[PDB]
C-alpha cells in the first residue's frame, strides 16, 4: 500500500523474468555458442600467425 512496495514488487518481477530466461536457456540448452567461440579465438590467433609469416 505504498510506492515503495510497488517498486519492490516490480523489481522482483523483472529479476524473476531474468532468472526465468537463464533457466529457459538451460532447458532448451546452454552453451552451443560457448564451444564455438573458444574455437573462433584459437583459429583467430593461429590464422594471424600464418598470414603474418
Amino acid at each position: 500500500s505504498s510506492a515503495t512496495s510497488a517498486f519492490e514488487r516490480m523489481e522482483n518481477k523483472v529479476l524473476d523474468m531474468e532468472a526465468t530466461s537463464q533457466a529457459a536457456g538451460e532447458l532448451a540448452g546452454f552453451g552451443i555458442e560457448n564451444q564455438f567461440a573458444q574455437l573462433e579465438a584459437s583459429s583467430g590467433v593461429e590464422d594471424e600467425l600464418a598470414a603474418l609469416k
Binding site: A3, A6, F7, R9, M10, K13, V14
Partner: protein, 54 residues
C-alpha cells in the same frame, strides 16, 4: 473465528487477483509517477516555509 478465516481467504484471493492485474512495465512506471506527484506537493510546503523564513 470462521468469519475472519474466510476473510483471510478472500483478502488472499483479492491479492492474487490484483497481483495478476499488474504489468510491471505499466506499473513500475506508474509507481514512479506517484512518487513524483507526491514530491511536488512536499516542494510546495517547502516553498512556503522558505518564503516565511525570508
Amino acid at each position: 473465528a470462521l468469519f475472519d478465516r474466510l476473510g483471510r481467504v478472500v483478502r488472499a484471493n483479492l491479492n492474487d487477483l490484483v497481483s495478476k492485474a499488474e504489468d510491471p512495465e505499466k506499473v513500475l512506471e506508474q509507481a514512479v509517477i506517484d512518487m513524483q506527484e507526491d514530491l511536488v506537493q512536499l516542494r510546495q510546503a517547502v516553498a512556503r516555509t522558505i518564503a516565511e523564513e525570508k
